[PDB]
Amino acid sequence: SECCFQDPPYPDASASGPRDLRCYRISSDRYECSWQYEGPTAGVSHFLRCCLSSGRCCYFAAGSATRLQFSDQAGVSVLYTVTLWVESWARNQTEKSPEVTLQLYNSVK
Amino acid sequence: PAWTQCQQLSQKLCTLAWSAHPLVGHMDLREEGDEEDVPHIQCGDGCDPQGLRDNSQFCLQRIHQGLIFYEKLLGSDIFTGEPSLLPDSPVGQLHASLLGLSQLLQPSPSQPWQRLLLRFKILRSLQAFVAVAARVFAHGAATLSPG
Amino acid sequence: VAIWELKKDVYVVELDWYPDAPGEMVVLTCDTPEEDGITWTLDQSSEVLGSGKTLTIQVKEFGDAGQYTCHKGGEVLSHSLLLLHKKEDGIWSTDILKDQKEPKNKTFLRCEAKNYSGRFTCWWLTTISTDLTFSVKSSRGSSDPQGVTCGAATLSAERVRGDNKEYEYSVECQEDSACPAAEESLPIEVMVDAVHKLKYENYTSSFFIRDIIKPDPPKNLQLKPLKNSRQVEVSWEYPDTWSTPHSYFSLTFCVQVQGKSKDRVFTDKTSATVICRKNASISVRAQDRYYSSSWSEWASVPC
Amino acid sequence: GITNINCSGHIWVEPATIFKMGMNISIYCQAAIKNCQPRKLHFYKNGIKERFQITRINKTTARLWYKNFLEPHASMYCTAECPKHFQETLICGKDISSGYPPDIPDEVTCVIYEYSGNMTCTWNAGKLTYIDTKYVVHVKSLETEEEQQYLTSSYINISTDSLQGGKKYLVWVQAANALGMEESKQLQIHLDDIVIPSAAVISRAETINATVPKTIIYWDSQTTIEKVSCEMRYKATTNQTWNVKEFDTNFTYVQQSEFYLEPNIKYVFQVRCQETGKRYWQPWSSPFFHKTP
Ligand SMILES: *[C@@H]1O[C@H](CO)[C@@H](O[C@@H]2O[C@H](CO)[C@@H](O[C@@H]3O[C@H](CO)[C@@H](O)[C@H](O)[C@@H]3O)[C@H](O)[C@H]2NC(C)=O)[C@H](O)[C@H]1NC(C)=O
Ligand SMILES: *[C@@H]1O[C@H](CO)[C@@H](O[C@@H]2O[C@H](CO)[C@@H](O)[C@H](O)[C@H]2NC(C)=O)[C@H](O)[C@H]1NC(C)=O
Ligand SMILES: *[C@@H]1O[C@H](CO)[C@@H](O)[C@H](O)[C@H]1NC(C)=O
Ligand SMILES: *[C@@H]1O[C@H](CO)[C@@H](O)[C@H](O)[C@H]1NC(C)=O
Numbered sequence A: 001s002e003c004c005f006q007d008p009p010y011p012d013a014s015a016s017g018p019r020d021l022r023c024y025r026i027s028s029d030r031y032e033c034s035w036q037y038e039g040p041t042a043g044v045s046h047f048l049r050c051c052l053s054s055g056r057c058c059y060f061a062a063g064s065a066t067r068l069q070f071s072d073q074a075g076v077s078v079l080y081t082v083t084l085w086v087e088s089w090a091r092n093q094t095e096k097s098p099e100v101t102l103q104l105y106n107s108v109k
Numbered sequence B: 001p002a003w004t005q006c007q008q009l010s011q012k013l014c015t016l017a018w019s020a021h022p023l024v025g026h027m028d029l030r031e032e033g034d035e036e037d038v039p040h041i042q043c044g045d046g047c048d049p050q051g052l053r054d055n056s057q058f059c060l061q062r063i064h065q066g067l068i069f070y071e072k073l074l075g076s077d078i079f080t081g082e083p084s085l086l087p088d089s090p091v092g093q094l095h096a097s098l099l100g101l102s103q104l105l106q107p108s109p110s111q112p113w114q115r116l117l118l119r120f121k122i123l124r125s126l127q128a129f130v131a132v133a134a135r136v137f138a139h140g141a142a143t144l145s146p147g
Numbered sequence C: 001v002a003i004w005e006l007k008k009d010v011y012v013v014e015l016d017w018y019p020d021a022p023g024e025m026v027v028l029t030c031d032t033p034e035e036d037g038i039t040w041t042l043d044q045s046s047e048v049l050g051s052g053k054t055l056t057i058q059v060k061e062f063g064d065a066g067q068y069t070c071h072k073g074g075e076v077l078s079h080s081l082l083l084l085h086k087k088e089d090g091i092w093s094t095d096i097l098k099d100q101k102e103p104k105n106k107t108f109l110r111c112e113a114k115n116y117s118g119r120f121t122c123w124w125l126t127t128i129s130t131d132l133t134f135s136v137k138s139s140r141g142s143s144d145p146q147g148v149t150c151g152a153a154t155l156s157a158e159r160v161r162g163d164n165k166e167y168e169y170s171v172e173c174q175e176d177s178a179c180p181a182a183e184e185s186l187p188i189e190v191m192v193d194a195v196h197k198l199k200y201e202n203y204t205s206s207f208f209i210r211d212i213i214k215p216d217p218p219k220n221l222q223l224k225p226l227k228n229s230r231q232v233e234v235s236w237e238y239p240d241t242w243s244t245p246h247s248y249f250s251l252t253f254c255v256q257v258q259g260k261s262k263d264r265v266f267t268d269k270t271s272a273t274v275i276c277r278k279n280a281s282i283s284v285r286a287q288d289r290y291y292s293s294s295w296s297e298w299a300s301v302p303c
Numbered sequence D: 001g002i003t004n005i006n007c008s009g010h011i012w013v014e015p016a017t018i019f020k021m022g023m024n025i026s027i028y029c030q031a032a033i034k035n036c037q038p039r040k041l042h043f044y045k046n047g048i049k050e051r052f053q054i055t056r057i058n059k060t061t062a063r064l065w066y067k068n069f070l071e072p073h074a075s076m077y078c079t080a081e082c083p084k085h086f087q088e089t090l091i092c093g094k095d096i097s098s099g100y101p102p103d104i105p106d107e108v109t110c111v112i113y114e115y116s117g118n119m120t121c122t123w124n125a126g127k128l129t130y131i132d133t134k135y136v137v138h139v140k141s142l143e144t145e146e147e148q149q150y151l152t153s154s155y156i157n158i159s160t161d162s163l164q165g166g167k168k169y170l171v172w173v174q175a176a177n178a179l180g181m182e183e184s185k186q187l188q189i190h191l192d193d194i195v196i197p198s199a200a201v202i203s204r205a206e207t208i209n210a211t212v213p214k215t216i217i218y219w220d221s222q223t224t225i226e227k228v229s230c231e232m233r234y235k236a237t238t239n240q241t242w243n244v245k246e247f248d249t250n251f252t253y254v255q256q257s258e259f260y261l262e263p264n265i266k267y268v269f270q271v272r273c274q275e276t277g278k279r280y281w282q283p284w285s286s287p288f289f290h291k292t293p
């Protein structure tokens, strides 16, 4: 998995959506991100977006999966603070999860 | 002829050498003395199979020097002081088998804790020497003995 | 601490890795004899901040590494590839290779030799398959090193573990002037450079040839009955890959009886007598006779 | 190199490398490898790696703790795991000893066996020391006040030829080991009063078939001393009491002691003698059995 730094294929914009985004450091250089979705999972595509310190922002295409892993060379910085959230496009409009921002390196647990 | 006695006693030596110290390779520790003196079977010392067919005198000159060199150490305080090495212990028999075999060819301070580590170093370095020595005797008794 | 050149126009920068690190500022210079309006373009990047003959960017993440290019007047003068060497609390990173656990912990490089001829094969493991490059160089001794020529690292095996695939790489090396009969004093030094995308790491391993020797399994294993007491005479031969002659490079064998349930005898001869049972299998290993190196693999036959 | 250890660090013990037996001890190992921050630090006791009570207090220093260390000797050495080496890196080692401080020597006694020509001084050393304990015997003349000292590990024979200044002397003993040092009370001697005659031995035991059965005991000694008193003990082995007779014997001739005893019982006989009036006696002779007719 590699972070694409272009725009997601939907317009930016309901109460239903994903929630409870949790990311830790699972290995010496690999990471894992888990979230949950409130609603039917038919046709739902999740996309984990991340913004670096320079202001540049990228996204991960998670597909139908509600869990995504990535290495330390996918474009997401781990030594400095980033901004994470999950966007889901099922039908009609876009759905978002609560915001979670932290330094990924010291998330060892 | 005389090659058979050197072959049988060297066979016992390789048994006694490893029997005295069955430690595996990863157990051996290393110390900051990377830089190099101790007699080794150098390349071209005539101990290869072709060297013995050409002239076995060259290889025995180095093996003889090594057997009296390692014998000099089993007689040193390293192998006699505290902690006492038992004479009938498999390490003790190595001394006499070293001198006896050495005879057939051509008729210092230390503290009790350092000796344990030193004794380990000598035995391992000796094992590689006795190995190649038992090879030239096995080859000699199988090729030059019948004639 | 410092920076060093790996090969032509390829550099590795050492970086202490901890959170909120300042990184290490890096001074890059274009290989231009004279210019007053130099812009800098990193690979594809359209955004261009580079100015002047020298560009300094604060290297503090992988995003600052890659191929930096400086082209004057629409013509490319030279390139420059930057790799990162991750230092973490005084420990060099070891993410590319896998811990082999054999024979002890943290044994990333493992090497075997089928004989004393001076040819050996070192192998490693990794959990990735793409953007991977290895570089192996070796010699005997460090002070006045002797010549050792190594081939190319190639994929040899690919298996499955719990949830991912495990990739096995290997390289063939040959000592230029090998002395099999000699008692080794200076060890063989194997140095492997590894680059995954923009991440660089290096490994090392020291050994004597006599300590990494693992003969090939016995050759032509067969059985034949004995009418007196229905005992079996097992017969085998030395493996072809073993050193020659056999009157000098002797071996010792181990014969055991296994019968689909739950018998070992050692000998220096090339035959032995055992007792067979129902659906039992006889197997034999091999080891150097005068030096306790590694055992060979099993060669088995049914009763 | 090959004939010597090259320590790459140092090791120290608290309270000390030599300590009182049964105490808690802490062994500290500090590494000093040129280009290696150790991943792990191991301890070996008598070549056996230790697995418990080891704490990584410092990235380069480790502490091994023992509760109630009872071994009198032990060879310690510690190593380091270095990332650039497949071998464990030797740090340093040290021999530790355990024992007890010496007691105050008492029961100091100095005698001169007659023809031995030298004076034998002994004492009670006290508790077991387990460690190398040395003893210094001081001899001072009550006349010329000059003091000689003598080192030993057990007891000592001092030649009478070295006892020139007078016949009256003071003797005390000093005991010392790594853990302590003590001194005895002064004992004064008179070289004429501390002589013990040469050994007296029993020869035979004869019984006579006459009016009353006489058990004649033959015994003798080769002593030049004139005034000599002796004692002899005799008991039936079935009995548990000692009967004794005293004699002022003249060893020019073999002595004959006439005893009137009961027939057909086992008996035991022992003798000891001294210069009359002097302080010290002989030890009791070896038991001499004799059944009567
Ligand atoms: C290679 O390195 C690993 C590093 O983890 C070694 O693992 C060691 O495993 C033991 C046993 O799990 C750990 O000690 C014990 O842990 C168990 C719970 O698993 C517990 O019951 C005990 O009280 C004790 O804590 C040990 O901590 C661990 N090593 C380290 C450095 O933490 C492994 O043994 C090494 N060897 C090989 C051949 O892989
Ligand atoms: C001090 O002298 C005495 C004799 O007066 C020694 O006693 C004997 O010495 C001989 C050797 O000369 C030994 O074979 C005996 O075993 C000793 N004991 C006896 C009971 O005869 C004594 O050895 C001398 N002191 C020391 C410390 O040896
Ligand atoms: C191995 O990598 C380290 C990390 O920067 C580097 O300093 C060192 O030079 C490399 N090894 C050698 C033998 O140069
Ligand atoms: C050693 O320490 C333990 C507790 O740490 C204590 O119970 C014991 O009395 C100590 N022994 C000595 C001799 O100090």
Ligand SMILES: *[C@@H]1O[C@H](CO)[C@@H](O)[C@H](O)[C@H]1NC(C)=O
Pocket: D030, D058, D059, D060, D061
């Ligand atoms: C512990 O390590 C520090 C380095 O951070 C050093 O200054 C200190 O002397 C060490 N202490 C001991 C007891 O070795």
Ligand SMILES: *[C@@H]1O[C@H](CO)[C@@H](O)[C@H](O)[C@H]1NC(C)=O
Pocket: D115, D116, D117, D118, D157, D158
């Ligand atoms: C005197 O002491 C010495 C000390 O060696 C001893 O050997 C000897 O038996 C003693 N008696 C003599 C010399 O009459």
Ligand SMILES: *[C@@H]1O[C@H](CO)[C@@H](O)[C@H](O)[C@H]1NC(C)=O
Pocket: D239, D240, D241, D242, D243
């Ligand atoms: C045992 O010895 C005591 C002490 O002299 C003596 O009185 C007693 O009679 C003895 N026993 C016999 C049975 O004679």
